[PDB]
Write a protein that binds this ligand. Structure first.
Ligand code: HEM
Ligand SMILES: N#C/C(=C1/SC[C@@H](c2ccccc2Cl)S1)n1ccnc1
Ligand SMILES: O=C(O)Cc1ccccc1Nc1c(Cl)cccc1Cl
Length: 402
């Protein structure tokens, strides 16, 4: 008996770090902006598979980001960890979203990010010093890809780096969590740590965004103590995990396209455009597109009903051939403009300027300090994270000329 389905299972896992899963490429090819899918618990939902329609729906206020809504398209049991506690502004709609987000934007401006350039370079070259002095073979993730953005975001947040082993482990346990209880345990571990950090700042006013939020908004009752915890946790995990994944996958991808890597090294003028193309191509946050319709939405003849879950899959939208000619080809020289790796609209990634800065610095540093860098194993031996979480590899064995 045939098993062809109208709503295939979603999400799907990558088999190649920089290629869509086979199922996603099928969704990309099927005409129309929408397609039905079956989530892990049997409920059906819509997935958006085209670029301009993704922009349109991301800007549509009728698609809500409220993750506490019972009809929100949860794609894994671990998603329950964020549903039970107060929502950081990633899970808020206007006007609450803007009031909370504006409490944090000062630390992510173009002026502040450019101001952080010397300390980002210092942290990058510091962890490179330690890795190269230790010699190959090293795991690029635990020795460079993860600690670099961890240290940077901690200094931005005011989180003491001396506790890094604790909250890096709690962050990883949440990222890789495959059940609800494990995710909630790792989340409460972070919540308990951040709550004590708040009390510490109330005794002794401190630096970083968390200290600012404690001294001002919390003391004026304009943010709840548990919203501060959720917001700080969002920035902490995002600061750690997204950049680390872009680093490891950019290294894997660039080494599989050695002509473009050598061209990139020969001209650092190309690093900014190469970073945009890597963001479009790798789209490591393609699971973070969930929305729920609060009213009927008709999309090019197809009707989204109120109460239906919608998932804007930015990896698929970033492979729209009508926007990026030959979209499945990595081209660091192409115009990667208007890609959706960071989203679009009111929720577009607050840390996008920081991720762009860190990746540029990291890529330039790897080409300067370790040009003989190469993988210590075939990419087929690398272990990919599933489509239910942030795209990445659990470890990246690398070697170089000692
Ligand atoms: C290459 C790295 C990153 C990628 C690919 C990425 C991707 C995304 C995407 C697709 C969204 C949209 C979520 C939605 O529409 O529901 C988002 C939002 C967000 N990201 Fe990132 N992100 C990255 C790095 C970071 C970093 C380093 C931070 C540090 C704080 C961060 C913090 C946030 C926040 C706070 C939001 C929510 C903004 C809002 O709701 O107004 N991200 N990100
Ligand atoms: N990547 C990423 C990222 C995420 S927030 C929501 C996360 C998520 C949503 C739904 C299901 C599973 C997961 Cl894990 S993924 N982020 C955070 C800041 N900027 C980007
Ligand atoms: O979304 C959040 O509030 C925290 C956060 C920040 C960065 C990356 C992921 C997550 N959340 C998250 C995690 Cl770490 C695991 C499973 C499901 C979710 Cl929603």
């Amino acid at each position: 008996t045939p098993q062809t389905t109208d709503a295939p299972a979603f999400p799907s896992n990558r088999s190649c770090p920089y290629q869509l899963p086979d199922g996603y490429a099928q969704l990309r090819d099927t005409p129309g902006p929408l397609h039905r899918v079956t989530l892990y618990d049997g409920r059906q939902a819509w997935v958006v598979t085209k670029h301009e329609a993704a922009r349109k729906l991301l800007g549509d206020p009728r698609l809500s980001s409220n993750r506490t809504d019972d009809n929100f398209p949860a794609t894994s049991p671990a998603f329950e960890a964020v549903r039970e506690s107060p929502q950081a502004f990633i899970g808020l709609d206007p006007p609450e979203h803007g009031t909370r987000r504006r409490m944090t934007i000062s630390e992510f401006t173009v002026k502040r990010i450019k101001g952080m350039r010397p300390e980002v370079e210092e942290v990058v070259h510091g962890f490179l010093d330690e890795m190269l002095a230790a010699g190959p073979t090293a795991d690029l993730v635990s020795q460079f890809a993860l600690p670099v953005p961890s240290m940077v975001i901690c200094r931005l947040l005011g989180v003491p780096y001396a506790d890094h082993e604790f909250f890096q482990d709690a962050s990883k346990r949440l990222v890789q969590s495959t059940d609800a209880q494990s995710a909630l345990t790792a989340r409460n571990d972070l919540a308990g740590y951040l709550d004590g950090l708040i009390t510490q700042f109330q005794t002794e006013p401190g630096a970083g965004l968390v200290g600012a939020l404690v001294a001002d908004q919390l003391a004026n009752g304009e943010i709840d103590r548990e919203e501060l915890i959720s917001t700080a946790m969002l920035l902490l995990i995002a600061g750690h995990e997204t950049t680390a994944s872009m680093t490891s996958l950019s290294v894997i991808t660039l080494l599989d396209h050695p002509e473009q890597y050598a061209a990139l090294r020969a001209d650092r003028s190309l690093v900014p455009g190469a970073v945009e193309e890597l963001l479009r191509y790798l789209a490591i946050a393609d699971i973070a597109g969930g929305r729920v319709a609060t009213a009927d939405i008709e999309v090019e003849g197809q009707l989204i009903r109120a109460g239906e879950g919608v998932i804007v899959v930015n990896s698929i939208a970033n492979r729209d051939g009508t926007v990026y000619e030959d979209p499945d080809a990595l081209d660091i020289h192409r115009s990667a403009r208007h890609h959706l790796a960071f989203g679009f609209g009111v929720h577009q990634c607050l840390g996008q300027n920081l991720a762009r800065l860190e990746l540029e610095v990291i890529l330039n540093a790897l080409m300067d300090r370790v040009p003989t860098l190469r993988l210590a194993v075939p990419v087929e031996q690398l272990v990919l994270r599933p489509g239910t979480t942030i795209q990445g590899v659990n470890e990246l064995p690398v070697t170089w000329h000692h």
